[PDB]
Write a protein that binds this ligand. Structure first.
Ligand code: QUI
Ligand code: QUI
Ligand code: QUI
Ligand code: QUI
Lengths: 8, 8
DNA sequence: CGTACG
DNA sequence: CGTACG
């Protein structure tokens, strides 16, 4: 869920 | 210089 | 040069 | 799940 790299 | 990971 | 999550 | 610089 969290998006800090990919943004699942 | 720029710090986005390490911050040289 | 290496950090950053639910 | 993978991004982010001078
Ligand atoms: C988002 O909250 C989230 C949490 N755990 C994960 C594990 C693996 C792939 C994606 C994920 N996304
Ligand atoms: C994003 O590319 C990425 C990769 N590894 C991580 C590890 C821990 C937190 C966030 C992360 N984000
Ligand atoms: C900062 O601006 C900066 C620019 N280039 C680098 C190359 C290698 C190591 C650190 C660096 N820091
Ligand atoms: C910080 O850990 C890190 C690593 N690789 C990068 C590549 C491009 C831009 C910023 C980056 N930051």
């Amino acid at each position: 869920x969290a998006x800090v790299x990919a943004x699942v």
